[PDB]
Amino acid sequence: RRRKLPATIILRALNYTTEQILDLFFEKVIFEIRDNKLQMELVPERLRGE
Amino acid sequence: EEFDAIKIALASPDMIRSWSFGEVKKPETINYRTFKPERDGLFCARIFGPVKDYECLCGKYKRLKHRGVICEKCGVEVTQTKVRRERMGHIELASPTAHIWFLKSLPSRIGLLLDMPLRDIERVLYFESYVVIEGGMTNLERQQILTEEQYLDALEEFGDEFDAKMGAEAIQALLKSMDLEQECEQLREELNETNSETKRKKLTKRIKLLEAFVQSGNKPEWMILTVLPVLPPDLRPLVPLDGGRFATSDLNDLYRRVINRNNRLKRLLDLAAPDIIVRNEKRMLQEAVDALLDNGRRGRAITGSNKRPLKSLADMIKGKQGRFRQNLLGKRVDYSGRSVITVGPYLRLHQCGLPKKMALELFKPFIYGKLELRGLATTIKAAKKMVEREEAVVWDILDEVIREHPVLLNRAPTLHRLGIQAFEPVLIEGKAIQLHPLVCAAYNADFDGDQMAVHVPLTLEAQLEARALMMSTNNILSPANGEPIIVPSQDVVLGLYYMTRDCVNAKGEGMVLTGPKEAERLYRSGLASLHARVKVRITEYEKDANGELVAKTSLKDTTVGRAILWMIVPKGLPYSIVNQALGKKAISKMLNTCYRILGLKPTVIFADQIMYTGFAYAARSGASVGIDDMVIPEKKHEIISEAEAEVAEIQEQFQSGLVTAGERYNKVIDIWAAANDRVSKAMMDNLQTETVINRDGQEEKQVSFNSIYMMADSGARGSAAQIRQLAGMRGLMAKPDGSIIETPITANFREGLNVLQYFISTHGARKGLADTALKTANSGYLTRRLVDVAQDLVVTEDDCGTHEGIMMTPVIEGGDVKEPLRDRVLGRVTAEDVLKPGTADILVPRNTLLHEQWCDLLEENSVDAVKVRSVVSCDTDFGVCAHCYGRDLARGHIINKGEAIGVIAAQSIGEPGTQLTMRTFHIGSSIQVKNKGSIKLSNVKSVVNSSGKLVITSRNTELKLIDEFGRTKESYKVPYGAVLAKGDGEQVAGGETVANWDPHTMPVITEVSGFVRFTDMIDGQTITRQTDELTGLSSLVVLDSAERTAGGKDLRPALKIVDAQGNDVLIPGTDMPAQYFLPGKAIVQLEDGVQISSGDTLARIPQKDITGGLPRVADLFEARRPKEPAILAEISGIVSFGKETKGKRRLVITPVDGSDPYEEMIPKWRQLNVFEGERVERGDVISDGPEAPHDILRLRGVHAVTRYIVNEVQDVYRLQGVKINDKHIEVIVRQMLRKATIVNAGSSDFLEGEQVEYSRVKIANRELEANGKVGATYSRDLLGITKASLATESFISAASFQETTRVLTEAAVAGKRDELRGLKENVIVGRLIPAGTGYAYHQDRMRRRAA
Amino acid sequence: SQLKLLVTRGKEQGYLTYAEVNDHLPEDIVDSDQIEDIIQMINDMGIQVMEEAPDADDLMLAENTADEDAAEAAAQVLSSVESEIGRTTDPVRMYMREMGTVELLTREGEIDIAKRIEDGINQVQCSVAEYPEAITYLLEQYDRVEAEEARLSDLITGFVDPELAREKFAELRAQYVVTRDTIHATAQEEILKLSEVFKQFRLVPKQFDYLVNSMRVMMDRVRTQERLIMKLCVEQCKMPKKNFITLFTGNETSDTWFNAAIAMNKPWSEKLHDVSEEVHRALQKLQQIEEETGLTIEQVKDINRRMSIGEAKARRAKKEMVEANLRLVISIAKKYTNRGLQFLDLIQEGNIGLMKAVDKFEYRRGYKFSTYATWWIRQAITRSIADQARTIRIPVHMIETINKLNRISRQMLQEMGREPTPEELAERMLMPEDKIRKVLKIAKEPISMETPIGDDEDSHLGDFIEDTTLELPLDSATTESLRAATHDVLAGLTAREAKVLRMRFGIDMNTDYTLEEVGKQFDVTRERIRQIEAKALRKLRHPSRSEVLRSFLDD
Ligand SMILES: [Mg+2]
Ligand SMILES: [Zn+2]
Ligand SMILES: [Zn+2]
């Protein structure tokens, strides 16, 4: 029951760096520039109610 | 031994030797072979006296004549053995040692006495760090601590003219070397020069402290013990238990430890060990003594051979087991007993039954006296053998001792002062205390095995008090309201409600009777039923003449039932009281009218006659319950099918995506509760009028005799809810989370309950249990906390002699009048005379006890407000005058002189508190007059618009409803500028709307009618491009601060009103020209280019839960400021804005001319309900929300805050439907707002910003301004009870309920010569209480003193 | 500062938690004793929790105490404890930390420490042989002892048979008398012979303390006389240090350097005139001390100075060694941590024992001082744990018997299988079969009279031990009734009858008399008394006169 800490500290101490932390706790949304101004990938489920 | 005030102070060492009887020296206690005490250890013979009465230790001297001579062989003063209980011996602590209380009390006594922080004191004590003690004048400050190496160098620095120690020797040197008059002069100096309010604040505080510590008889070094007294031998015994095992107290252990360590330190000193050794030893002795005193504040107790920390001297005084709370208030009591109570209806209400055997065990001394009086046993031993044989004649002698000897009967928790009533006895076979039946409502005692205890009053004053004050038939009026507490409860009312009803065609229909007497002669012989409607010739005695009783025969049209009830009703009552159904409410107001008309004797004898006849005809009814009695509605299956189809609708619509899950859940629960109410109504209408029977004709329907319906109608038990659960379905069990389950119980108790449904019932059932388990274990916390604050308060003057009371009127919360005036001016005594509306008169003198005759007059003349004298403005010094408390009591006359009203007040507020939900609990745009009656407007500021309608330009115009009587029949609170229709004081018609306004949006309607333009409205800076742009509505609405520039914040959004040319007409009365300025979000619609009409919405400005538990009352009396404090005016004058938005925008209000500059900082996240151009009255609603009672008290005045508290807590009760008269809350408030503050002392001698209590400062300036001198301004305070009880003139009192240690130590340093004359004080020290009968005795001692 | 944020949150929120406080606390202390102190302070502060669980309902609902003037001091104690340093708590840890500043080895540096100790004892030994009253005290003790007023083996604790000692007493007697019988031709040779004949003897430490105390009293006399000289000359006459020590040094015997100094035509000489007699008395006591001893006061000072310096060296060596061996004491004392006594009490007993070990060590048997003092430490702590541990104190042999019984009880309770009976202990042990009953009756502790007998509302064993010696109110009423009855009975006699029958008993008077005093009253210490007493006894034996008395018979 000692002091609090940033909970990511245990994950970094588990031989995890930031990239694989983010890719453990998140899905992905890509952004591209295909000949014009920042195209986007779009799965239909992503953008519900926004 | 009628001594005096008790006195407390420091324990000077030579005083501690005068207490001594010889130094304890050795740790032995007893001798392990002969269990005499070794000399001399914690125990002794020569120190603390002899073991056996009048017998030496070695045994040389063993006769009463030799008392006093100390045996030459073992020096034991041959005297009594109770002298073993009063002798204190001392210890000669080799090195000194610091008393833990004057070290770790919290605010260190030594800390703020030496002007030194605590950590350095712990340094010098535990040898962390050296410290100077009068280091002379070379380099070092007096308090200047050091460390090891620094002292080592400084010895080379100043080996001479230098003085540095460490240990208790150091603190003692400092305290002794201190000179207090020097520090008083120095502190008065820096009070002179150092002109910094914080600085000279703490400066003058410490000088207050030192002058106090000087004006005691104390000395500063007495806080550091050199000599430490041992408790005697017999307060910490070493009892020989059976088997050689001894069961000693713990102080023997602690003193053994301390004596060991003292001897060991002396032994170390003789050798002169290296300094690590002696230092660790002195630390060990310090910890030992500090564990002796408190065994806490040191960090970790020193537990004995158990794992349980061993108790110590600061712990045999403290706690709910210390001597204060556990053996000075709760003490066992000889001459008592107990048993299982029982029913016993054959008793008048002034005699409790009682067993022969409890009687012959309680009254043995009385029996013995009588038996040596009648010569049935020459000596007392013979009388004992007799009454222990249970012979023939001791029963006769016991009946001669139990003739008029009232036993006190108590129940387990004695909440309210009817909890302890006396009775006479009536000797009885058995072992159940056959209690009376009526009194059980008062005790709150069913007969499920509850055990009442009987005491016995020994003396003769106590017998006259157990007869003239505590007899059963002198407490029938509940102390918390005048209504009798002898309400007939369950079998008696069912008996009457069966007796006085009427079935349509019983025997003996319509036949006339010659009176009540042959009504009984018909019923008993059987010629006619108990109830069948019948003409009789009653003869009621109305007593309208002055005390007369004018007979008047007649032929009332009644039943036989009512008539046979009439033979028991006494004279003065009128026959229309027993001609009705006689439910429970009516059968109790029967007794109420009896007490209000005929006094007390006929009401007592009449309550007994009612119980007798009630039981008799309740038994004759055979009012049984059977399983054909609970009729199910035959229209139940349809209703359940219909609702279970509506849930099909919502299920289909949920799986069409039309409603969320929350919505379908709410709708389901809504249609089930609707089906529930419909099924319950259907059963109740199949149940009430169900019986259909037939008088000599076709048919006819009447109220039914379904046994469960009479049991639900009378008020005997239950109601329509329990009748619901027995016949209709039973609702929706609510799971203990608070969320209500959605699967209702479509079955009931006459049908079964399959497994799921019963189980779902289990949730709410066990929540009810788990709360009424915590309520019975924490039931009296509120009464406890109130009698702590409101206890020493005693009605100790006949007439305070004032003219200042609080104005009483009937409460009206925007509707039907909640509480009329005859329930509020019933008992209280008028303040200023009352004038009939033409003044016509002098209706009532100012000192008339308003009993019901005067309420008769006041209600015959339609008086609206009666400025009645009140407890919170009585002008008495340490008391409350006779009149101003009023009259209310278990009796009906004026309150006697002395009768301790603080306690019965706290109990009037605390015994119904059992009858309230313990969890807190939340209940949750046009005006419509009810009926005929004129309109009445207060604070109305209206304008005669060119439109015609009426609009109020005052923030606080109350819309009342007056009739041609003049009474206030209704009142409503108009918002600002509501569109008003009818006249101001004129007439309207019933049920007709008269006021409409804007629900959410605030009009800014103009003052007079003149041309319009704009000023300082630049878009982007002060205004924005708003418009209902489909309509053309150019709206350049005022910009807020986050959208106005940083110079825009310096801009003034405005609405100028031009006259016919371009100038600005003066505002009528004032000289501010015609225009309105506006804040942010002052949404503008129209623009420059129109002449306004009065009632022009120049802008559009947008925008209750009543906790009802007991904790709402706890927090009301605690007076905690709420979360959102109602911001409130401060100076009666014009309003304005301040330094714009420094996080919290600053208001500014200004009077006509006086001290204007008041600006207030407000969290601008909250609405400001004030105009930008108005004159806010002092004590006016700038904002909304609950307003803090402190602000009421400081802005408005006393009577405002007292009416606030009483109406708030009265809301909390009469929500639940509990009656409690307002004397009690007003007296608890008078104990709340007791302290005071000062503004300008002036011709008195109190510190300006000091807090002193009202009585003291008021007598001070009353006697001074009585002289030629000038008074002293005081700003009244208002403390919560938990803090307003926290200050007490006595310390013996405050050593009970406060934490004992702080009380004792503060009084100790202050040398506070505590008088007696409280009630905690005298109940502790065991002399006469100065409250009730003891008051004349204390007046006796007052006369003795001061002469 | 953040702990002050804990303070403000405890103020607002109305409580805290172990997690909250453990969050805000100042890092790096975590002893859990400072923690318990600070938690008690936050309790004593406005916050009144300390919590675990957040709430809390109608069960003791809406509680609070203002407690003004405690918050400002408690928050102050917090902000001061955090900012400055982390303070130590308790006293065992005090002792640990305070002795941890001891350089914890003397690997054969004990030899140098004992060297310093021998230096001190030998310098003070030269003081011994040189102090005249030492030898006079020895000779006086010898005479007192020989007559039989004291023992020879009580005075001196052996040299390096009391007749050997006695002939040596006569040898040193002749040495001292020949030293004294030459009053300045061979005085140094005389003192040499005396010292070299007395410097292989020895005495009891308390006899040496008596020697040193007469020596200290000699020093106190000389210091009081030097006060009478200098505090009456310098500090009474403005006769400063230089102008006083010009004549106060070197010879320091004659009255001349004061009286003739009065005549040296100086201000101090013009102020010493009324202190002349007082300093004359001072130098007269000084020369009477001279008369006493034989050596100048300056030799007095030099001798006591050498003694004091040797004593200081020896005490300092003792201190240094004990500071070293405190670790040994702690290690050896850890082994009794539940004997019925405190850890610190054990280690303090060990301190005393280690001091005695230091005082009774010698390298002249080749010991290793660590293991040497281990025995003394364990013995002293054993003596203490026996003597002052039990509540009611049992003696040492009794504690030895008790631990014998416990050892044999353990041996039998796994030899015989179940457990032994007293009849079996009285044959494994060889006690009289009844001492074992008394021993195993006695050797048990007492029960704590605040023991929680929790079988009730909330009670204690102390609240259930009734009082046995109180007289019943029935008894007191019977006593008063019997007094009244017998008084009326005795009134139902004659004056002489009643007087004799009160006196020969203790009725309505002090303790009861003898026939000697009965006769000293009624003139006849003879059968008149017997006649009256027995005849009145017969008269009151009359039924119809003592029926009520015999009704007072509890048979
Ligand atoms: Mg019950
Ligand atoms: Zn004696
Ligand atoms: Zn009054």
Side-chain angles (χ1 to χ4, degrees), chain C residues 114 118 122 159-160 200 202 361-367:
Chain C
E118 291 179 350
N122 289 316
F159 303 109
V160 175
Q200 291 185 357
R202 192 179 70 191
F361 179 71
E362 294 181 354
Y363 72 96
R364 295 178 68 190
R365 194 181 296 106
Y367 281 156

Side-chain angles (χ1 to χ4, degrees), chain B residues 1264-1279:
Chain B
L1264 294 182
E1265 188 270 332
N1267 210 166
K1269 294 181 183 179
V1270 67
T1273 60
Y1274 56 92
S1275 176
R1276 189 72 69 91
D1277 277 336
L1278 184 145
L1279 284 76

Side-chain angles (χ1 to χ4, degrees), chain C residues 201-217:
Chain C
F201 296 0
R202 192 179 70 191
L203 280 71
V204 173
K206 290 177 258 73
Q207 297 300 320
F208 179 75
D209 283 328
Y210 189 83
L211 290 173
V212 175
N213 287 318
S214 183
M215 294 180 181
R216 296 177 189 266
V217 173

Side-chain angles (χ1 to χ4, degrees), chain B residues 681-941:
Chain B
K681 179 177 74 175
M683 65 86 66
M684 187 59 71
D685 285 328
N686 191 5
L687 199 285
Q688 57 182 358
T689 193
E690 175 58 28
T691 51
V692 296
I693 51 173
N694 44 12
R695 172 75 173 98
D696 70 3
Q698 280 66 237
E699 287 181 356
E700 181 183 2
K701 67 177 187 178
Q702 70 191 1
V703 291
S704 170
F705 295 116
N706 199 166
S707 301
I708 200 163
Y709 183 68
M710 294 186 292
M711 293 182 286
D713 193 2
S714 73
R717 297 291 295 277
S719 67
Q722 296 175 358
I723 304 299
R724 175 182 300 163
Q725 293 176 356
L726 272 71
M729 73 170 72
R730 52 99 55 88
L732 285 71
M733 273 55 261
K735 68 187 290 187
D737 191 1
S739 292
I740 168 171
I741 290 168
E742 63 181 356
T743 294
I745 316 296
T746 72
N748 52 4
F749 280 108
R750 191 179 187 271
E751 296 176 353
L753 280 80
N754 55 359
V755 184
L756 263 295
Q757 294 173 351
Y758 186 80
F759 181 76
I760 301 169
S761 172
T762 300
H763 301 293
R766 183 173 296 179
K767 179 67 167 64
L769 279 183
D771 277 336
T772 57
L774 291 175
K775 183 186 174 187
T776 302
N778 295 318
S779 181
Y781 71 97
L782 200 279
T783 67
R784 187 177 300 279
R785 195 175 300 169
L786 268 71
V787 298
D788 284 333
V789 62
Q791 194 175 7
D792 192 359
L793 192 153
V794 177
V795 177
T796 183
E797 280 179 352
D798 190 1
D799 192 359
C800 68
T802 64
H803 296 88
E804 295 80 359
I806 64 176
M807 185 63 74
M808 293 299 174
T809 59
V811 298
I812 303 170
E813 184 66 28
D816 191 357
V817 58
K818 293 182 184 294
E819 188 169 2
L821 189 151
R822 187 176 184 270
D823 287 332
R824 299 174 67 89
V825 187
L826 180 54
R828 307 179 73 79
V829 176
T830 59
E832 68 183 3
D833 292 332
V834 178
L835 280 303
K836 194 176 189 294
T839 296
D841 280 328
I842 297 170
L843 175 57
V844 294
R846 67 174 178 265
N847 285 318
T848 64
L849 180 64
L850 291 179
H851 49 83
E852 282 77 0
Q853 283 74 12
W854 296 104
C855 291
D856 292 328
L857 289 178
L858 299 178
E859 195 174 6
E860 293 287 328
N861 294 316
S862 69
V863 173
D864 294 332
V866 181
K867 184 175 183 179
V868 69
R869 299 176 60 182
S870 180
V871 170
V872 75
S873 69
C874 177
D875 197 359
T876 301
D877 307 331
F878 293 160
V880 171
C881 72
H883 293 95
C884 289
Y885 178 75
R887 78 97 180 265
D888 187 1
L889 195 60
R891 73 182 298 167
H893 293 175
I894 188 168
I895 201 70
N896 300 116
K897 183 186 286 186
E899 187 167 359
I901 66 171
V903 179
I904 70 173
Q907 294 180 358
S908 294
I909 291 172
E911 67 86 19
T914 300
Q915 301 175 0
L916 294 164
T917 63
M918 66 180 289
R919 306 291 186 188
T920 187
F921 144 73
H922 295 83
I923 64 169
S925 180
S926 296
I927 297 168
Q928 189 71 40
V929 68
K930 289 174 72 175
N931 303 116
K932 185 263 186 181
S934 177
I935 302 299
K936 192 72 175 69
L937 281 72
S938 296
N939 290 318
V940 61
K941 190 184 289 185

Side-chain angles (χ1 to χ4, degrees), chain A residues 1-4, chain C residues 19 22-23 27:
Chain A
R1 304 289 290 167
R2 302 287 190 89
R3 294 178 62 252
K4 190 180 285 184
Chain C
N22 194 0
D23 187 359
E27 304 175 358

Side-chain angles (χ1 to χ4, degrees), chain B residues 540-552 570-573 597-598:
Chain B
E540 56 180 357
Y541 291 167
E542 190 180 5
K543 65 183 291 183
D544 196 359
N546 52 357
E548 296 296 329
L549 284 78
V550 171
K552 58 179 181 181
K571 295 295 188 180
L573 277 76
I597 297 171
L598 277 71

